[PDB]
Amino acid sequence: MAMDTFITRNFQTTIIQKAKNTMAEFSEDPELQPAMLFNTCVHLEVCYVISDMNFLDEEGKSYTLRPQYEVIEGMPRTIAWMVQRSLAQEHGIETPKYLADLFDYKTKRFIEVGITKGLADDYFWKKKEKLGNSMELMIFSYNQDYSLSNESSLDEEGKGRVLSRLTELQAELSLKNLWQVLI
Ligand SMILES: O=C1c2c(O)c(=O)ccn2N([C@@H]2c3ccccc3SCc3c2ccc(F)c3F)[C@@H]2COCCN12
Ligand SMILES: [Cl-]
Ligand SMILES: [Cl-]
Ligand SMILES: [Mn+2]
Ligand SMILES: [Mn+2]
């Protein structure tokens, strides 16, 4: 099985289209770069999972009514920048200098999501070298490890559902001799 075929079988059409659109903005070609398309699909999928299972009520109380998180990843950078900058103004906070992956309506922070094949901690601190504390960080590995800058933001159950998806994907890729494509 080829990577492109795996992608089309394991990811929703919306995610695939967005990740390709994004690679195009950077003029990376999805057909020449199937590992990048895979990685971008996973990252965007994780973002969507996080936003899909956190809601808030009229007062501001959590629940596993309105979405807790706005996904900024997956839009064209020009729109994404207008959206980041406008959310930040409308909540009276600093606009980060990097483009974020999510906005948390509860804590009023921008979130950077990271996916890694190494250890979650190594990728946490690397991200923090650039971002300082402009954003919260949510780092997931394919080795069942995580590294949140705020443990409450995401529930212990939810971290585990993202970790299991990743574990699912690594398993199938390995079964199909495609994991080596990513390493
Ligand atoms: O927003 C991201 C980004 C992240 O948010 C991230 O967590 C990791 C990596 N990123 N990068 C993603 C990306 C995202 C997920 C997995 C791998 C890659 S690999 C580089 C690349 C990305 C997107 C399109 C493209 F053509 C690329 F070459 C670029 C880094 O420059 C800001 C935009 N961006
Ligand atoms: Cl950026
Ligand atoms: Cl940089
Ligand atoms: Mn991003
Ligand atoms: Mn990210």
Numbering used by the authors: -1 to 62, 73 to 191
Describing publication, verbatim:
All four PA-BXA co-crystal structures exhibit clear and unambiguous electron density for the compound, which is bound in essentially the identical fashion in each structure. When this residue is mutated to the more polar threonine, the structure is essentially unchanged in both the FluA and FluB structures except for the side-chain of the residue. Thus, substitution of Ile38 by Thr38 reduces slightly the van der Waals interaction with the compound since threonine lacks the CD1 methyl group of isoleucine. Furthermore, unlike I38, which does not change conformation upon BXA binding, T38 (and M34 in the case of FluB) have to change rotamer to accommodate the inhibitor binding. The reduction of susceptibility to BXM for the I38T mutant is less for FluB compared to FluA. Since the direct effect of the substitution, as observed in the crystal structures, is essentially the same in FluA and FluB this suggests that the contribution of I38 to the affinity of the compound is proportionally less in FluB than in FluA.
The heterotrimeric RNA-dependent RNA polymerase (RdRp) of influenza virus is composed of subunits PA, PB1 and PB2. It is responsible for replication and transcription of the segmented, single-stranded viral RNA genome (vRNA) in the nucleus of infected cells. This culminated in the generation of the compounds BXA and BXM that target the CEN in the PA proteins of influenza A and B viruses.
